[PDB]
Design a protein around this ligand. Structure first.
Ligand SMILES: C=C(CC(=O)OC)C(=O)N[C@@H](c1ccccc1)[C@@H](O)C(=O)O[C@H]1C[C@@]2(O)[C@@H](OC(=O)c3ccccc3)[C@@H]3[C@]4(OC(C)=O)CO[C@@H]4C[C@H](O)[C@@]3(C)C(=O)[C@H](O)C(=C1C)C2(C)C
Ligand SMILES: Nc1nc2c(ncn2[C@@H]2O[C@H](COP(=O)(O)OP(=O)(O)OP(=O)(O)O)[C@@H](O)[C@H]2O)c(=O)[nH]1
Ligand SMILES: Nc1nc2c(ncn2[C@@H]2O[C@H](COP(=O)(O)OP(=O)(O)O)[C@@H](O)[C@H]2O)c(=O)[nH]1
Ligand SMILES: [Mg+2]
Ligand SMILES: [Mg+2]
Lengths: 426, 440
């Protein structure tokens, strides 16, 4: 029994978090009322990882919902699976965070953070052997970014020997709510460099482009973006939720994926992705080639602009394991230039028999590539374009922050970019 | 929670408030007696319209508003008007002698006698709020009360409600409807005194509204009633995000994040479309593309200035009615290819969009046609400093001769306050030049 405690914070964090719980509840046979009604014991074998078992053989997500305004969590509670969450695990304020990292991290968020830690402590105390935490949030707003990283720091203080994992949505001017998003993201990224073990970098620019160019969605909504994320989150957690040999827990995943402590930012990918053809059967070569294509990756970085340190690939459904190996070793041997030579056998493959709801075959990609520096470079450029003229800083200095904290955050992320470039040339 | 308190100061502020609250009642289905048969939450609630309306146990929906004037005849029309039952007598505050178009009388001589009562009444409204978000202050630049008492009130509100947000709707003077030669004096004095106490101010050039009414509504000589009904549509578009909720609805404070890059640079330019007579609208359905294009015609701006001769720091589009994002995006793409839109090099060039789904409405007997969709553009452009330059020049012409200054000194003001105010305006104009110069 290796339990994971899930936290979703802010608007983006709770919207993507709600869809993640809808998806995996269906996979494990849990209905919106928390009753199991599946037909396979594999659905229950590792259900303890994400669900508590309450009275009457009911399953309650080990999930905590956090926000500084009630709006999004009201819509979650009134949503499809809104009644499955523990009512005491809704922790919310009223003032909001105003897309302001300082409000989430230092003022408004600091008033609420102790109440979230009370619920984290309650869930942790009921764990046979807690392995760690997973946080869903965006970096471009105030609550998920500012309060989310505050929560990570306080959790690390109270559980220093547990794994911290995040699904972090990176902002992009193409799918942007406010101009201060590079400020909030730059301040948050430094927190993640220090206080997380694994971070999935989900770029809203990549999600939009996939919806528009690949899925042929002329006007993608946030709901369309969150549909891609929930499918991806289900894929990357398959190894945690079903019986398997590879990356079966958060710490073994980290040991396999993170060769240097600060370089723990992963590019996720999913296949298939196609326009609505839809009933057409997918073959192993087609899954493998799509899963490794940049068009299927969600960090808007070109992996041919860098090199893979480590890769994890997860295949779902009934397929030929021999054929999976051939195509996986095929793409590996044919494109050996893009895998670092000093980490032998750095591509690991897992297969899970249970496929998602609507597909017979699927594949999920997790890459630790030095090309992720392009993401951090874009944020640094957008940060500097405003900070050079101290633009919009009054929103933050009004909350007590000084300009020196921005300078230090700028230097920290440029250091991170330089670290990636060191190993890209290695 | 998230309540907003409106404060209407002087004749212009009060009469515009009359137009705004009448329009709000029509938009929300609130009758002149305050009853709202659709609101099943009797005596309370946390609906979106509750940001602007409190509720009594008898089912009356009461504006979160205070009306204040230093003479009684304008507010007396509210006390006996069609919507008299909407307000309780304590919300309508009057003196006996006005400020005589003299900032010094509104801020000092006459204003000091009523300021404490006004603050007591505002406190009574604030005590009924579970999460007060801030204040909306309506006033003219040119009147003695609108200029002098507003600045006194804004100063006192900063002390009593710290940094809680205060937004202005400010009536910029126009010679076609002006009543005082000294309005440039009052405008500069109140702009200087209020500058550090206001988080965001929407200036409304009476000449721009006057010209729109003449050109677009075929009104030969617009009255205040004509001007105020147009102004209330613009105010309603701006506050619609606070009073209605939806999935494409972007809160005003989120627009505000993009619109105010530096504390002093807090004067958005508003542009509204469509302004059309019923006889012209009866043929046309104006599309999303057509109303969006009209937002970049200078003739539709609320302040006369040339944004083609400035730089943009932000561009916000607030749609209401039958509008979907697909049509907005296509309209914006067309605009960027064909229009003169230059941003400063230090800010993103995108447009921030909000959509509020309830269609606009009009007051019966008005001149504006009821349309299926409307849009208010809020832009932060350096060109709005042109409005300051025109006022500053009229100030300089009179002050160089000290014309009319004795009226202010006679009420206790010093010449140093004039030059201090004028120098602040000079620095503000220079601030607008600086923000628009490319980085190095
Ligand atoms: C519970 C849900 C939400 C839902 O949908 O319930 C309302 C869910 O998504 N679960 C799924 C899942 C997948 C991976 C891991 C865990 C779960 C799965 O089991 C399923 O149902 O996929 C859904 C997803 C589809 O929408 C659709 O995608 C989209 O248009 C779309 C739009 C925006 C964003 C993302 C997708 C989908 C795609 O996406 C996927 C995911 O396959 C896209 O390219 C993939 C190929 C699919 O052939 C194609 C084209 C389909 O045509 C198919 O007929 C179908 C299935 C199989 C839907 C039309 C209903
Ligand atoms: N748009 C509009 N402008 C108005 C209205 N009433 C007055 N004004 C303008 O306001 C300025 C004069 O200020 P007022 O508001 O009338 O004066 P006041 O605030 O009552 O101050 P005093 O009467 O001097 O004590 C002039 O520029 C007028 O054109 C109005 O109802 N609508
Ligand atoms: N993919 C996705 N991104 C979102 C969603 N909602 C907001 N965002 C992004 O998150 C950032 C805004 O942060 P948000 O979560 O709304 O602020 P918060 O509530 O203070 O944490 C911007 O970069 C948005 O593009 C969502 O539902 N899905
Ligand atoms: Mg948001
Ligand atoms: Mg008057």
């Amino acid at each position: 029994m290796r339990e994971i405690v899930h936290i979703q914070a802010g608007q983006c964090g709770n919207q993507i978090g709600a869809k993640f719980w809808e998806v995996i509840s269906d996979e494990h046979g849990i209905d919106p009322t928390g009753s199991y009604h599946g037909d396979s014991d594999l659905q229950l074998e590792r259900i303890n990882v994400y669900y508590n078992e309450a009275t009457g053989n009911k399953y309650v997500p080990r999930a905590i919902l956090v926000d500084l305004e009630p709006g999004t969590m009201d819509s979650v509670r009134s949503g499809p699976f809104g009644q499955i969450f523990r009512p005491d695990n809704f922790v919310f304020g009223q003032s909001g965070a105003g897309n302001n990292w300082a409000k989430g991290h230092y003022t408004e968020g600091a008033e609420l953070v102790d109440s979230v830690l009370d619920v984290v402590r309650k869930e942790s105390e009921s764990c046979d052997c807690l392995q760690g935490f997973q946080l869903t949030h965006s970096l471009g707003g105030g609550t998920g970014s500012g309060m989310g990283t505050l929560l990570i720091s306080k959790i690390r203080e109270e559980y220093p020997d547990r794994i911290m994992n995040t699904f972090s949505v990176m902002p992009s001017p193409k799918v942007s709510d406010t101009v201060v998003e590079p400020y909030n993201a730059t301040l948050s990224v430094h927190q993640l460099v220090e206080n997380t073990d694994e971070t999935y970098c989900i770029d809203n620019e990549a999600l939009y482009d996939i919806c528009f160019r690949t899925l042929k969605l002329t006007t993608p909504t946030y709901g369309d973006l969150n549909h891609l994320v929930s499918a991806t989150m289900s894929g990357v957690t398959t190894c945690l939720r079903f019986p398997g040999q590879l990356n079966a827990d958060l710490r073994k995943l980290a040991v396999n994926m993170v060769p240097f402590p600060r370089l723990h930012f992963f590019m996720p990918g999913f296949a298939p992705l196609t326009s609505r053809q839809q009933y057409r059967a997918l073959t192993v070569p087609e899954l493998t080639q799509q899963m490794f294509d940049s068009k299927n990756m969600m960090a808007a970085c070109d992996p041919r602009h860098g090199r893979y340190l480590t890769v994890a690939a997860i295949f779902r459904g009934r397929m030929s394991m021999k054929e999976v190996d051939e195509q996986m070793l095929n793409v590996q041997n044919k494109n050996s230039s893009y895998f670092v030579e000093w980490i032998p056998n750095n591509v690991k493959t897992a297969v899970c028999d249970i496929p998602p709801r609507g597909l017979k075959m699927s594949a999920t990609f997790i890459g630790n590539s030095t090309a992720i520096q392009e993401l951090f470079k874009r944020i640094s450029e957008q940060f500097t374009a405003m900070f050079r003229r101290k633009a919009f800083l009054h929103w933050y200095t009004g909350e007590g922050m000084d300009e020196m904290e921005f300078t230090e955050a700028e230097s920290n992320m440029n250091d991170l970019v330089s670290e990636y470039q060191q190993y890209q040339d290695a | 929670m998230r309540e907003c308190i409106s404060i209407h100061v002087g004749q212009a502020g009060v009469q515009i408030g009359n137009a705004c609250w009448e329009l709000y009642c029509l938009e929300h289905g609130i009758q002149p007696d305050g009853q709202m048969p659709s609101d099943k939450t009797i005596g309370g609630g946390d609906d979106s319209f509750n940001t602007f309306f409190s509720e009594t146990g008898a089912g009356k929906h009461v504006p979160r508003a205070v009306f204040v004037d230093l003479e009684p005849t304008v507010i007396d029309e509210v006390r006996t008007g069609t919507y008299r039952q909407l307000f309780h007598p304590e919300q309508l505050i009057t003196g006996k002698e006005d400020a005589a178009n003299n900032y010094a009388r509104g801020h000092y001589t006459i204003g000091k006698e009523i300021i404490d009562l006004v603050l007591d009444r505002i406190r009574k409204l604030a005590d009924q709020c579970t999460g007060l978000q801030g204040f909306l202050v309506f006033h003219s630049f040119g009147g003695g009360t609108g200029s002098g008492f507003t600045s006194l009130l804004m100063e006192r509100l900063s002390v009593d409600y710290g940094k809680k947000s205060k937004l202005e709707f400010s009536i910029y003077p126009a010679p076609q409807v002006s009543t005082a030669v000294v309005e440039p004096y009052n405008s500069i004095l109140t702009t200087h005194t209020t500058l550090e106490h206001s988080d965001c101010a929407f200036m409304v050039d009476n000449e721009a509204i006057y010209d729109i009414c003449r050109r677009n509504l075929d009104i030969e000589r617009p009255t205040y009633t004509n001007l105020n009904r147009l102004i209330s549509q613009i105010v309603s578009s701006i506050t619609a995000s606070l009073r209605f909720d939806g999935a494409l609805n972007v809160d005003l404070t989120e627009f505000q994040t993009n619109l105010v890059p530096y504390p002093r640079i807090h004067f958005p330019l508003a542009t509204y479309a469509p302004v059309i007579s019923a006889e012209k609208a009866y043929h046309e359905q104006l599309s999303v593309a057509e109303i969006t294009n009209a937002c970049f015609e200078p003739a539709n701006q609320m302040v006369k200035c040339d944004p083609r001769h400035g730089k943009y720091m932000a561009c916000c589009l607030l749609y209401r009615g039958d509008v979907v994002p697909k049509d907005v995006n296509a309209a914006i793409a067309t605009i960027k290819t064909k229009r003169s839109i230059q941003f400063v090099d230090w800010c993103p060039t995108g447009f921030k969009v909000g959509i509020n789904y309830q269609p606009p409405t009009v007051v019966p007997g008005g001149d504006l046609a009821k349309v299926q969709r409307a849009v208010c553009m809020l832009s932060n452009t350096t060109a709005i400093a042109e409005a300051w330059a025109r006022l500053d020049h009229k100030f300089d012409l009179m002050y160089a001769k000290r014309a009319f200054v004795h009226w202010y000194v006679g009420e206790g003001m010093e010449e140093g306050e004039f030059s201090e105010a004028r120098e602040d305006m000079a620095a503000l104009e220079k601030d607008y030049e600086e923000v628009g110069v490319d980085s190095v």
